[PDB]
Design a protein around this nucleic acid. Structure first.
Length: 91
DNA sequence: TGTCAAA
């Protein structure tokens, strides 16, 4: 089961295939997100990143490895979190 | 909104 096979399966309606991608990548994504947001907020941001990746998977062209695309989604989700945090903290 | 080398 390569990432590409799992992605193809999800794009064909096999939702549970995506759970294998989450199991494969959640530790890496948490580590990445922890570079950007406070430790207590990492799980929330990681969860959002994975939901966004899943819901946008139909638009993923496969012009990179899945993880390359997911990595950038995670970074940008963290960045959006920081913008929202700035607003809430009146920065 | 999009995020597509890899990381």
């Amino acid at each position: 089961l390569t990432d590409q096979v799992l992605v193809e399966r999800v794009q064909k309606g096999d939702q549970k295939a995506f759970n294998l991608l989450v199991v494969r990548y959640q530790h890496k994504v948490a580590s990445l997100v922890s570079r950007y947001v406070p430790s207590g907020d990492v799980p929330d941001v990681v969860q959002e990143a994975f939901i966004k990746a899943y819901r946008a998977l139909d638009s993923f062209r496969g012009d990179s490895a899945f993880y390359t695309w997911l990595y950038r989604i995670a970074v940008n989700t963290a960045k959006n979190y920081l913008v929202a945090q700035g607003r809430r903290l009146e920065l």
